[PDB]
Amino acid sequence: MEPLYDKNGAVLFGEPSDTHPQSTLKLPHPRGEKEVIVGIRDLPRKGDCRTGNRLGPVSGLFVKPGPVFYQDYSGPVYHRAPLEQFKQAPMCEVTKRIGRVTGSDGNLYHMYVCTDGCILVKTAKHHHHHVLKWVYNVLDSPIWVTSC
Ligand SMILES: [Cl-]
């Protein structure tokens, strides 16, 4: 299974892996002052990193199926998309581009939210033209999509 990470960047099982350098998650980076759920209309901005915003502290953007979005999160998170829980799908009708995530395969993916609420990834680079939807989340944890 792809590992989860605690708020201090330590792996909770398995072995640590580096993020892809082109991901929008840039580590090491603190997080977890508070769990802060936000709606798709109130995603955080870069300029919210040091001050937080009116909603709370900000460490970046986290997502899990539902969809549920967060601007900070304290529990276990993915640093890479757990592709064993995704499924190849056609490209959906996109509502928002939300970042560039490292797959559990080490590759770079563009991440999107679809009009159906699904979270979708598409290979950014070589091997590109692979598109998958996040269909299972058996450990009920988000991906850290962007850090601020
Ligand atoms: Cl997994």
Author numbering: 21 to 168
What does the report in the manuscript say about this coordinate set?
Npro is a key effector protein of pestiviruses such as bovine viral diarrhea virus and abolishes host cell antiviral defense mechanisms. The nonstructural protein Npro (N-terminal protease) is the very first protein to be synthesized, releasing itself from the nascent polypeptide chain via a single, autoproteolytic cleavage event (Wiskerchen et al., 1991). Detached Npro is proteolytically inactive but acts as a viral immediate effector to modulate the host cell’s antiviral defenses (Ruggli et al., 2003). The overall structure revealed two compacted folding units: a protease domain (orange) and an interaction domain (I-domain, green).
Here, we present crystal structures of Δ(2–21)Npro from a BVDV-3/HoBi-like strain to 1.25 Å resolution, revealing a two-domain structure. We determined 1.25 Å and 1.5 Å crystal structures for solubly expressed and in-vitro-folded Npro, respectively. In neither case could we observe zinc binding at the TRASH motif but disulfide bridging between Cys112 and Cys134. The mixed disulfide of the third cysteine 138 with the reducing agent 1-thioglycerol present in the protein buffer indicated oxidizing conditions during crystal growth. Individual C112A, C134A, C138A, as well as D136N mutations in the TRASH motif abolished its zinc coordination and partially interrupted IRF3/IRF7 interactions in the Npro homologs Alfort and BVDV-1 (Fiebach et al., 2011; Ruggli et al., 2009; Szymanski et al., 2009). These findings corroborate our modeling studies, indicating that TRASH disulfides are reversible and able to adopt a zinc binding conformation without major alterations. The unexpected disulfide may point to such a function in Npro that awaits further investigation.
